[PDB]
């Protein structure tokens with residue numbers, strides 16, 4: 001019941017006590033593990049608030065203090081009165097940072113406490129949302145010196161007044177299906193790229209068209225907004241050895257800013273909370289260029305390299321896949337844009353792990369997502385046993401707006 | 408209760424109904440997932456239900472469920488349990504359990520071949536020499552001059568646990584590893600402990616970087632004995648690279664037969680503590696794990712040095728670059744000597760087909776994603792985007808404590 005994890009490369013053993021403060025469920029049972037599955041009222045609300053405020057006041061060395069119990073009462077009362085409650089600013093920040101801290105699938109959590117939190121809870125319209133988002137993008141980009149950020153729109157009320165950013169990331173390239181059969185732009189975004197046009201977006205029908213923002217305030221019909229191009233830092237992709245690479249016409253954007261998750265604090269639900277950090281190299285090169293259901297340029301790169309694409313056993317995909325990721329990292333670093341390689345990130349995470357076990361008694365971690373999609377076993381996370389469980393505050397998935405929105 | 412796994416690359420959804428036949432525990436709960444953790448004497452009391460379960464399965468598969476043959480066999484097994492406290496498996500039954508133990512191995516990416524497994528019944532074996540003999544014939548048959556064949560040799564089942572047969576080796580064929588006084592390691596670092604054991608058991612170690620370890624065989628719970636596999640039975644492949652001519656000069660070679668010999672085979676409540684089995688290598692086992700892992704031969708750097716890589720910052724991906732070349736070489740050498748091998752793209756492609764087939768014809772295929780995904784180039788193999796369900800089915804291959812930790816020394 002006080003669980004142990006072993007690193008099989010270093011023999012190091014940590015003891016996880018933090019898991020006993022877990023609350024939500026995993027999907028697994030004693031009969032069947034689901035680790036590889038991608039997606040598994042007033043009386044409900046107060047125990048949740050107490051749990052949060054209890055952990056909040058503990059973290060500031062004021063557990064069971066006057067201030068603590070005061071607030072606990074203050075919140076208890078407001079719930080009885082208003083059927084919800086509002087977070088103090090200090091609690092908001094704490095909640096945000098800890099949702100990142102508890103994000104078991106995020107390899108990048110070593111930075112967790114450095115989160116810049118933008119309180120956008122006064123926002124009332126899509127135009128308002130657009131402004132807050134532009135400000136978030138500008139601050140995070142910082143001319144290439146990326147800083148982590150989250151902007152938080154009003155919490156859910158009765159579920160009919162949901163704030164939502166429909167885009168999955170603030171910045172992503174359009175994908176359009178083609179007359180011949182294939183796909184131009186970015187296949188992952190094809191459906192959304194449609195929904196945008198269905199809302200009256202005029203697509204330049206290019207390969208790298210920055211998608212418009214589709215913002216929904218107070219449960220209203222969502223509106224389209226174009227991010228000022230001067231706020232979208234892009235990197236042209238070239239290889240440091242191969243000069244034909246540039247002719248592939250590749251670039252990628254500097255700012256990964258996930259916008260579709262729900263942020264849960266003290267039982268309050270923030271359905272619009274776009275957050276951002278910086279890219280790990282493989283995210284763009286392994287996943288975004290080379291996945292079959294994506295840019296799938298592997299073929300082309302290997303052809304330009306004149307590799308024996310005849311049998312799998314030449315490992316030409318592997319060879320190509322490496323060069324591509326070499327280029328991505330090369331390009332970003334050349335343009336002074338923050339990026340991290342998978343070796344650096346995973347090492348950083350193993351250190352963050354030792355820290356968390358040491359000063360918190362554990363660190364929920366999801367090995368299926370922490371191990372990079374290339375060169376897995378030569379990164380330190382591979383031989384690292386991990387324990388996965390759900391702590392609060394948390395980022396949760398939520399249904400896509402176009403499947404819910406009452407028009 | 409039905410469960411759906413989706414494939415996120417192809418949107419193909421499958422439905423698992425087989426997980427309901429699962430009995431054993433996973434280690435997971437609703438509050439904690441342990442899917443990334445590596446590790447998890449029996450009385451007549453629990454034996455017959457375990458036996459009945461198995462025999463039911465068997466007779467179902469041969470389409471004789473409820474038959475007189477089935478009922479008599481249950482009765483027959485029953486009486487033998489109440490009289491002898493255990494029971495013997497018919498040969499048909501032994502073969503079935505063997506194949507299914509493999510078939511149920513949720514970590515095995517190579518299960519597409521499961522029904523084609525040569526089962527050698529060593530249940531008449533009584534001594535270590537007897538074991539050496541059976542094992543030698545296994546290696547010879549399985550190797551087959553390089554055209555590898557799956558096989559397993561099953562030694563006497565456990566009785567009171569005081570008379571176990573065990574192969575003390577983790578695989579039948581493995582290179583020695585020697586710790587040096589300067590803290591460096593000569594040979595395969597994976598095997599240092601086992602090497603010391605052998606040496607202490609009287610093994611004259613040549614102390615080279617590729618010495619094939621002796622077998623250490625225990626029969627009937629007696630102290631284990633050393634035997635040397637005849638070199639002519641040990642097929643080895645010198646590793647060269649198809650474009651880099653300096654790669655041969657690294658002096659590397661690897662053996663062709665992966666034969667794991669330290670697992671326990673469970674069938675019908677019976678426990679076969681010595682059941683060495685073998686198939687053929689997936690390139691990445693040797694090329695990523697066996698050479699490049701930091702706690703193995705660690706030639707990663709030396710290969711990168713000779714490729715004149717920018718080994719200063721990791722951002723050059725020199726490690727990844729050297730890794731791929733080392734796997735290219737491994738596949739190249741094995742194909743060049745006509746020794747059976749499979750690359751990780753081929754293996755995972757086949758597993759996906761196997762898996763899909765299993766869902767249709769069997770209603771599921773237990774699979775451990777953490778182990779099925781290859782140790783390099785993960786997301787460019789089809790398994791990466793395949794959701795999987797992991798659960799435990801018997802017959803099964805189980806882990807078991809190293810015999811040196813649990814053995815009682817006669818002397």
Ligand code: HEM
Pocket residue numbers: 100103105106107108109111115148149150275276277278279280283340345369395
């Ligand atoms: C600063 C550098 C950061 C890096 C390098 C990083 C890296 C990653 C990576 C590689 C993944 C796997 C995602 C995939 O492969 O699709 C991930 C997931 C995730 N990241 Fe981080 N991240 C960073 C910052 C942040 C920040 C600022 C937040 C939130 C405040 C965050 C929260 C999350 C969450 C919640 C997930 C998983 C979402 C899910 O469950 O699907 N990360 N991250």
Ligand code: HEM
Pocket residue numbers: 509512514515516517518520524557558559684685686687688689692749754778804
């Ligand atoms: C014939 C070609 C085969 C291939 C290509 C293959 C491939 C693999 C690979 C790559 C692993 C990963 C192990 C690791 O990386 O540590 C594995 C695991 C495993 N294989 Fe197979 N295998 C084959 C045959 C067999 C046979 C003949 C058996 C049994 C009769 C078997 C049973 C198992 C079991 C039980 C595991 C899990 C190891 C564990 O639980 O620790 N495989 N297989």
Ligand SMILES: CNCc1cc(OCc2ccc3ccc(N)nc3c2)ccc1Cl
Pocket residue numbers: 038108256258276277278279280283
């Ligand atoms: C629908 N599947 C859920 C899903 C969520 C995902 O979230 C990815 C994610 C989330 C936050 C990030 C923060 C920084 C960063 N560099 N990457 C980040 C990546 C990614 C893939 C999938 Cl498949």
Ligand SMILES: CNCc1cc(OCc2ccc3ccc(N)nc3c2)ccc1Cl
Pocket residue numbers: 445446665667685686687688689692
């Ligand atoms: C306790 N760790 C379990 C473990 C099992 C292992 O078994 C590997 C294994 C087992 C069966 C195999 C069958 C065929 C094959 N080519 N490789 C095979 C490889 C290897 C490493 C570890 Cl760490």
Ligand SMILES: C[C@H](O)[C@H](O)[C@H]1CNc2nc(N)[nH]c(=O)c2N1
Pocket residue numbers: 008382383384385386443444445777778779780782
């Ligand atoms: C901690 C971790 O689960 C462990 O090192 C596993 C990870 N996945 C693996 N997968 C395979 N195929 N072989 C292995 O040895 C391992 N090691």
Ligand SMILES: C[C@H](O)[C@H](O)[C@H]1CNc2nc(N)[nH]c(=O)c2N1
Pocket residue numbers: 036037038368369370371415791792793794795
């Ligand atoms: C099927 C599998 O669970 C799914 O593809 C996961 C695997 N691991 C992943 N890991 C990361 N970091 N990102 C991903 O999108 C995925 N996809």
Ligand SMILES: [Zn+2]
Pocket residue numbers: 028029032033034035435439440441442
């Ligand atoms: Zn699990």
